[PDB]
Amino acid sequence: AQMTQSPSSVSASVGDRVTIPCRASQGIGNWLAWYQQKPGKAPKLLIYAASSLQSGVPSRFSGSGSGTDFTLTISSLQPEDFATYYCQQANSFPPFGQGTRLEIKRTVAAPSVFIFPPSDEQLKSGTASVVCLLNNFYPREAKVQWKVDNALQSGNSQESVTEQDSKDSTYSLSSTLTLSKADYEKHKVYACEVTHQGLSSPVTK
Amino acid sequence: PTNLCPFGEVFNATRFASVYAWNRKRISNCVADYSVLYNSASFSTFKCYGVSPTKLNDLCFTNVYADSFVIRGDEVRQIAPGQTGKIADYNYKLPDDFTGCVIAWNSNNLDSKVGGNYNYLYRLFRKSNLKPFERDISTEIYQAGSTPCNGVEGFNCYFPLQSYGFQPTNGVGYQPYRVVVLSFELLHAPATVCGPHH
Amino acid sequence: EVQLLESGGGLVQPGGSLRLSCAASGFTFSSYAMSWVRQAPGKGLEWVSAIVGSGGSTYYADSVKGRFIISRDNSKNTLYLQMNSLRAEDTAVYYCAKSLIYGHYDILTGAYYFDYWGQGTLVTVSSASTKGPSVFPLAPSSKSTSGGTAALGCLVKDYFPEPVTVSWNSGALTSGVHTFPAVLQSSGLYSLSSVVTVPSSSLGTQTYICNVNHKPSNTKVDKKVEP
Ligand SMILES: *[C@@H]1O[C@H](CO)[C@@H](O)[C@H](O)[C@H]1NC(C)=O
Structure with missing residues (x-):
């Protein structure tokens, strides 16, 4: 304590x-x-x-x-x-x-959010991972909330963030979604929603 | 003689006696630079009686005693000839004869605890004042009234030892102080504890 | 110069034993309390245990009572941490540290500041076998990036143990590249990603390969990231 x-x-x-x-x-x-x-x-x-x-x-x-x-x-x-x-x-x-x-300190900058579906080869191994980048945003606190068929996901996501970049004084974030190809056949509404200060409203890609 | 007096064992002893059970170490057959003793560090009290500190670098004594114990800051003043109060009356008493030095320092950083350290005790009650250098470690229940306690604590029947609560929020009058009392004894004998010059 | 040199860290299975060592020099060791502090990945420092100069009073963190023993050889100016029944979560970097003040006799009594600190050994509690990673692309599809900003990359998945080294074109693509810190999946295997933000127009037509390198398993993969 x-x-x-x-x-x-x-x-x-x-x-x-x-x-x-x-x-x-x-x-x-x-x-x-x-x-x-x-x-x-x-x-x-x-x-x-x-x-x-x-x-x-x-x-x-x-x-x-x-x-x-x-x-x-x-x-x-x-x-x-x-x-x-x-x-x-x-x-x-x-x-x-x-x-x-x-x-x-630095002016508040919103993240350039990207969405990346699972690989061909990894789906041959039987598992799938979905990557949602958050590149070069100043206020480090962020929300990223996956949405499978417009239902919120929990406990199946892993994040890791870099230390403040020496050059541009920003942070980056990656969030990974874990999915088996068995559970990957109920799919095709796969979204990443970022709640961030630099954005007036949450953004989905 | 030639070999250095072992003041470090007294002054740097890791744990100090409770004042009621105060400790005494005998110093013999050695040489004692008292200017270095000043210079160990940061003594909040270094007071001497019957001797000048700038002179017992030149003096020899039959024996030297070193008494140590822990008390509250605002009680260090009771470690002198002619003082009264709980410590002087009931735990540790110097004579008016005293020829020696009283050395003390704040020991908050070694004897306090965040919720208070209750392991250092003092005697709060006694039927008469201690004689000079007398030691009392007895724990008879103290009959403050007319009813024989028969060894059981009652309303006028108190256990004689009471606990300091040394906690860092105390502030200096109630923080613990380590005290060392050096006695210089000229007894009908050879001298064995000398200063480096003499 | 005070110095504290740590040794004994390494990889052990759940339930195993490890002994850590902290060789001390530049001071009177036996007069100072000493402690072990650790930092698990993605958590903050915590005191593992501590011991006064004499060795006669010791403290343990709740999570390790009954399982770790701290001790010292004052002859050899060395502090130890015998670790038994290790658990996955005992995985951390372990530092040893010296108390600023001297002379404590009881480990809960006094003021405890730590001036000198060792460099730390890594302790890994796992039953994963040495294994090389697998590399997957990060979808450099041309949808949603018809402008000057485009994101691609690789994905170093399912390796043990750490570390993994990623280059892009042998150190020639330095600007814009962010290699993430890895994470410990529930399988007991590590994963990370290496993303590069490149102007999508050409900036070198498909001239990109990620040079993954996993020394423990001797794995090197140069994977090209094409739509
Ligand atoms: C007490 O200990 C410290 C080192 O442990 C030493 O520097 C100091 O002089 C010692 N004091 C005496 C009176 O020996």
Whole structure:
């Protein structure tokens, strides 16, 4: 059971002054740590005792807060500061949770949605997979809802998203539908519906 | 002599006694640089009586005792000659004679717990004040009224030991402090604990 | 320089045993609490277990009580994690970490910040045999893309274990290509896709092959993506 809560994402540009709020369970007092993680890599202690700069850590990181409301602030955002940040109660090992993703701000861009039916060869193996791309959209949160014969699908879809592209500061999404050729013969209303901020209404292809 | 006094075992001992069961370590036949002791780090209290700290780098003593225990911050002031209160009266008492040093530091980061740590205890009741350096580890039920308790807790019948609740929300008067008390004993004997200069 | 060097990670079947090791240097090991932290794919860090400098008090995450034991040899400046009865979900990267402050005696008592961290070993709990992937196209049909934006690709399906390396024309098509992160299907096999956004007009008439490469099984497929 987790002990701390910070927002899922914060969006910022190099140079900016960034703050991350953190609400702790009562009764933590002083014992609050901030940790930085780049993907796949070990996390790094940035701040301890809620406001102490850890050795070797750049002075632009600072920590403040009393009681149950704490906050990490990054005065002058550098490009290497985009990472995930966790606020962590420093006793009885609480779980980390989703942390706060520090991503690059950018104008909101809608995804170029594509739909791809299953292969010939894969239908020789006896299984079918339907791919719905979502290319180069800024607001990462998205909905993709498959529709077989205008009925909603559940539990048969798998997504995976790339990290923010270095060049265009956008995200991409793929969603895969799993279907056996036995269950693939009741077909031909196969749609992908994307609910996204860049679109005034949901789009289907 | 020549070999260095083992202050590390006292000062860096991982766990400290409860004040009521305070511990005493005897220091003998060794050489003790007290300027390094200052310089271990960050002692919130380093007070001496009957001796100057800038001088027991030059002094020898028959024996040196080191008493350690844990208390609340706002009780550290009771570890001095002439003090009164729960700790001085009922748990640990220095004489007016005292020639030694009282050293203490905040140990929140080692002795507190998020819901409170109740393992450090102090004696809350006693029928008379402790004598200097006396130790009481007894747990007789305390008869605060006229009715013989006969070993069972009643309204005027209290178990004599009470628990600190060390929790990080406390703030310094109620956070735990580790205390070390050094006694310097000139007994009718050879000196064996000396400063590096003498 | 403090260093923490991890070893012992690898692939084990459900129910197996693994022993992890975290060799420590650059500090007085026996004075610091140490812990094991891990990160399963697509989840967040979690404390596996921890132990005070002396070894006399230890903590376990609920999901691993009774199955993992943490220990240390202070002589050899080494921390261990004996893992038994492993389950699929124990699959993760395991880091070891050192407590900033020294001198804890009880693992739930005191303040616990972790300054130094090892690099991590990967632990894989699976009964999948080494196997190479299969490559399927991603339908470069000309419907709905009569303009300058068109999407195609390949599909690296049903391999174990990771990794899979995808190139397009031996590293010559760099701009516009997004290789997705793989996913663990319910079959116990990995799948991903490699999509390229190309101007549909020509940009090289059908000059595209995806260079899939699966080192564990020695599989290389150059599949051409034609309508
Ligand atoms: C206590 O321990 C630390 C290292 O473990 C050391 O730097 C410090 O000097 C020690 N203090 C004493 C009084 O020995």
